[PDB]
Amino acid sequence: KMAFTLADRVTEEMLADKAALVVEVVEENYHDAPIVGIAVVNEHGRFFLRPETALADPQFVAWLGDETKKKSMFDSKRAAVALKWKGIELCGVSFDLLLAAYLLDPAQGVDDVAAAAKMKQYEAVRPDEAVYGKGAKRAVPDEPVLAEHLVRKAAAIWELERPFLDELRRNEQDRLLVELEQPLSSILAEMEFAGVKVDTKRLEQMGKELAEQLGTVEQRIYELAGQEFNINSPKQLGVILFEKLQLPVLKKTKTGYSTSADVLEKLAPYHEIVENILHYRQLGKLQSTYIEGLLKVVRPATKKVHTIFNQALTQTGRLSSTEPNLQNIPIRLEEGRKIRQAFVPSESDWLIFAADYSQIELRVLAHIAEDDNLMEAFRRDLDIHTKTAMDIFQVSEDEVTPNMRRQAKAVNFGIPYGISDYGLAQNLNISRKEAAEFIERYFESFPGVKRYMENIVQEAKQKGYVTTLLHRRRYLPDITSRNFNVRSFAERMAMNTPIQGSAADIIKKAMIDLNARLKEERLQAHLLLQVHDELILEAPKEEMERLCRLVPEVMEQAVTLRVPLKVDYHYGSTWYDAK
DNA sequence: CGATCACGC
DNA sequence: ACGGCGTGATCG
Ligand SMILES: Nc1ccn([C@H]2C[C@H](O)[C@@H](COP(=O)(O)OP(=O)(O)OP(=O)(O)O)O2)c(=O)n1
Ligand SMILES: Nc1ccn([C@H]2C[C@H](O)[C@@H](COP(=O)(O)OP(=O)(O)OP(=O)(O)O)O2)c(=O)n1
Ligand SMILES: OC[C@H]1O[C@@](CO)(O[C@H]2O[C@H](CO)[C@@H](O)[C@H](O)[C@H]2O)[C@@H](O)[C@@H]1O
Ligand SMILES: [Mg+2]
């Protein structure tokens, strides 16, 4: 049992200068979502407040907004954004249990207070699905049941703060929480709430044109197949290609015949249809995902989309982006790239500004592996893909063709993360003997990288985990497994996580540094998006010459490595034009 | 619901 | 079995 006051009014003792606070949003997507209840636990007791009451009370709202009144929460970004949608500011969050749990072990997939609690054998709180129900049974329960749940969550946060901080400190991860992840949560909240403005007319025009083209390509595909079928069914397509047209079966998966883009390209010498199928799939993706899917989530009266950056999901410390995902907007092909013309500034006479790290992962690799040859390339800003091409093809610089550089690109990206001769040969559609030579030559050229791959795997085996530059960890209990497949996957994770995760660390610290400076010089410029190794902003056009100086320097000096960090930048009237 | 396929880093 | 991390449309 747990005593608590189900309050009908806000009182002075509820406004202490340290509390656990719960501002409950039950909708998975919290943008413009109902707040269903509020709990406060502090030195003076435990309290449930109806939102209708607390959020209309001047003293409570002032307390929420006072940075000197410290709050411990779980997913303070959820609450801060839901409050923003109700026009209320939340300040003074000093501890976020979700971010603490994520840092202690991202593999646990902690997604509610109960799951965090279990890490410390705290059982005096129910799981959120046990109270609200799963999927179609999802509902806010009767007030006494809700109140007790919210109070129990607040009480768990209250008790768990110290145990979590003690373990983070033990791990030398406490500053990762308090100086990096928690300040970032604030910054992301602002990004999600501001949203990104979309030219829906343009998307609607594109959609109309795509539907025409889809129809044309579809009938042409039925013509060359001599049958009608569901092209979006890999199974039905496989029957057509490998049974009706008797094309060679190049790859069989655990389920059937592969019709992947790689396979279809390799089939091009056998039938023209595969080019049409590839074209259909590319148009089809644009339509369903980046036209239909985008327009479904745009808010019609403001024309904004409000993504959610999940800060506590990826195993390497990257962010993810959902509903809509704004981290996979097309760029590689010109047709898809045009989607970016529909991403526009939120005010007139504002511009989109985009800045990206040049090969952050390879630079981080150079730093961590301490390979002399790789480090010198970045110190001297030589094209690393051309350099590798020269080494693996054994030619001079002028003899490197664009196709050779593309092969070298896959070599540079793949080898340090454990690509084999088979994977390289399959990806590049080249001789497996030649792929194996590529690998031998790469390692004889960057021997520090070979030593890194050996050393980090051995460290993972000995410690049970790998670490990034700013002390993020990933545990790899699979790494000393007898079984080749299980062990091998773990070994490749040991090679990759310190590099991808350190890159994540660097850009997160860059975001925090940047917001400080923008707030410092009182510039209207603000962040809209992060795309793993790039930051996207909007600002009044007058602010562009400043941003060209400020943004790249802040990003490049976020950390100091054994090699320089390099940032490119562009701006224009749309995201497309910021090229 | 887990796989397949396409998009990004 | 045979580079890493994601989201999501779509299928059977
Ligand atoms: N108690 C600690 C110590 C370190 N770190 C992480 C976050 C730091 O940003 C990173 C850097 O490690 P250092 O021990 O080198 O600390 P700093 O470099 O931040 O301090 P300084 O460089 O001023 O010595 O390690 C942490 O999370 N918690
Ligand atoms: N198959 C891929 C493609 C890309 N990336 C990562 C590494 C790259 O640094 C980053 C950006 O991709 P680019 O193709 O732009 O890589 P570069 O900028 O190095 O190539 P280029 O010099 O041709 O722009 O995404 C990856 O890991 N695997
Ligand atoms: O609010 C983000 C935060 O909530 C969690 C659950 O604690 O995820 C929920 O919210 C996400 C954003 O809407 C959804 O994508 C997800 O499906 C839902 O469980 C955390 O995972 C996340 O960090
Ligand atoms: Mg590039």
How many degrees, rounded to 5, is the angle at CA A212 between CA A207 and CA A213? 95
- Residue A348's contacts (CB-CB under 8 Å, 6 or more residues apart) are none
Residues A203 and A187 in one domain: no
Query: Among A227, A226, A214, A221, which Cα is nearest to A264's?
Result: A221
Angstrom CA distances, A400 to A34, A438, A446, A569, stand at: 59, 15, 19, 27
Asked if residue A458 and residue A374 are part of one domain, the reply reads: yes
User: Which of A267, A283, A308 is where one domain is finished?
Assistant: A308
In terms of domains, do A62 and A172 share one? Answer: yes
Looking at the structure, tell me whether residues A170 and A217 fall in a common domain: no
Determine if the peptide bond prior to A324 is cis (ω within 30°).
yes
DSSP 8-state code for residue A289: I
Residue nearest to atom 6 of ligand 3 (CA): A111
Pocket residue to mutate for ligand 3, from A22, A23, A24, A28, most atoms within 8 A of Cβ: A28
- C-alpha distances out from residue A468 to A25, A109, A372, A557, A565, Å: 33, 19, 21, 18, 17
Q: Do A133 and A248 lie in a common domain?
A: no
Judgement on whether residues A258 and A375 belong to the same structural domain of the protein: no
Beta-bridged to residue A305, according to DSSP, are A196
For ligand 2, atom 13, the nearest C-alpha belongs to: A359
Strands (E), A453-550: 465-467, 473-475, 526-530, 534-540
Distance A445 CA to C9 C1' (A): 43
Do A90 and A80 contact (CB within 8 A), yes or no? yes
CATH number of the CATH domain containing A339: 3.30.70.370
Q: What is the DSSP letter of A91?
A: -
Cα torsion through A187, A188, A191, A192, rounded to 10: -150
Report CA dihedral (A445, A448, A449, A455) to the nearest 10 degrees.
150
> Looking at A447, A471, A503, which one is the last position of a domain?
A503
Q: How far apart are CA A265 and CA A569, in angstroms?
A: 34
Range of the domain at A284: 194-308
Q: A111 by DSSP, 3-state: which?
A: coil
- Alpha carbon distances (Å) from A432 to A246, A405, A406, A437, A457: 26, 18, 17, 9, 26
Euclidean distance between CA atoms A72 and A21, whole angstroms: 6
Same domain? A55 vs A75: yes
Last residue of a domain, one of A193, A224, A257: A193
Cα distance between residue A434 and residue A347, in whole Å: 54
Number of compact structural domains in chain A: 4
State the sign of the Cα–Cα–Cα–Cα dihedral A394, A395, A401, A405.
positive
Resolution value, angstrom units: 1.7
Nearest protein CA to atom 14 of ligand 1, as residue:
A172
φ, ψ for residue A240 (rounded to 5)?
-60, -55
Selection from A47, A51, A46 nearest residue A82 by Cα: A51
Q: What is the CATH number of the domain that holds A275?
A: 1.20.1060.10
Euclidean distance between CA atoms A153 and A81, whole angstroms: 19
Is the C-beta atom of A470 inside 6 A of ligand 1? yes
Residue count of chain A, please give it: 579
Clarify whether residues A166 and A234 are in a common domain: no
Contact A431, A438 (CB under 8 A): no
Q: Return the amino acid letter for A442.
A: Y
Determination technique for this entry: X-ray
- Report residue A510 CA to chain centroid gap: 16
**Within this chain, do residues A180 and A229 fall inside the same structural domain, yes or no?**
no
Q: Give the alpha-carbon dihedral of A437, A439, A445, A447, to 10 degrees.
A: -140
From the Cβ of A332, is strand B under 7 Å away?
yes
Residue A174 CB less than 6 A away from ligand 1:
yes
Rounded to an integer, what distance in angstroms lies between the CA atom of residue A361 and that of residue A229? 43
For chain A, the first-to-last Cα distance in angstroms comes to 61
If you measure from the C-alpha of residue A318 to the centroid of ligand 1, how many angstroms do you get, rounded to a whole number? 19
Whether residue A243 is found in the same domain as residue A320: no
Could you tell me what percentage of chain A is helix, strand and coil, using 3-state DSSP and rounding each to the nearest 5?
A: 55, 15, 30
A498 with A532, same domain: the answer is no
Residue A421 DSSP code: H
Among protein residues, the one whose C-alpha sits closest to the C1' atom of B4 is: A234
**Residue A576 near residue A564 (C-beta atoms within 8 A):** no
Which CA distances in Å does A59 have to A37, A234, A278, A479? 17, 60, 61, 54
Count other C-beta atoms under 10 Å from residue A301's C-beta.
6
Distances in whole angstroms, Cα of residue A298 to Cα of each of A199, A205, A345:
10, 16, 15
Q: Is A338 within 8 Å of A546 (Cβ atoms)?
A: no
Q: Is A497 exposed, middle or buried (0-12, 13-18, 19+ CB in 10 A)?
A: buried
Q: Kindly list the protein residues whose beta carbon lies within 7 Å of any strand C atom.
A: A 230, 232-233, 235-236, 288-289, 292-293, 310, 313-316, 318, 320-325, 327-328, 410, 413-414, 417-420, 422-424, 426-427, 484-485, 488-489, 492-493, 496-497, 500
Q: Is the dihedral of CA A254, A258, A260, A263 positive or negative?
A: positive
CA of A333 to the centre of ligand 4 (A): 13
CB of A111 within 6 A of ligand 3: the answer is yes
Q: In CATH, what number is assigned to the domain containing residue A64?
A: 3.30.420.10
Task: Give distance CA A257 / C1' C11 (Å).
Answer: 14
Q: In this structure, which ligand is nearest to the CA of A168? A: 1
In 3-state terms, what secondary structure has residue A303? coil
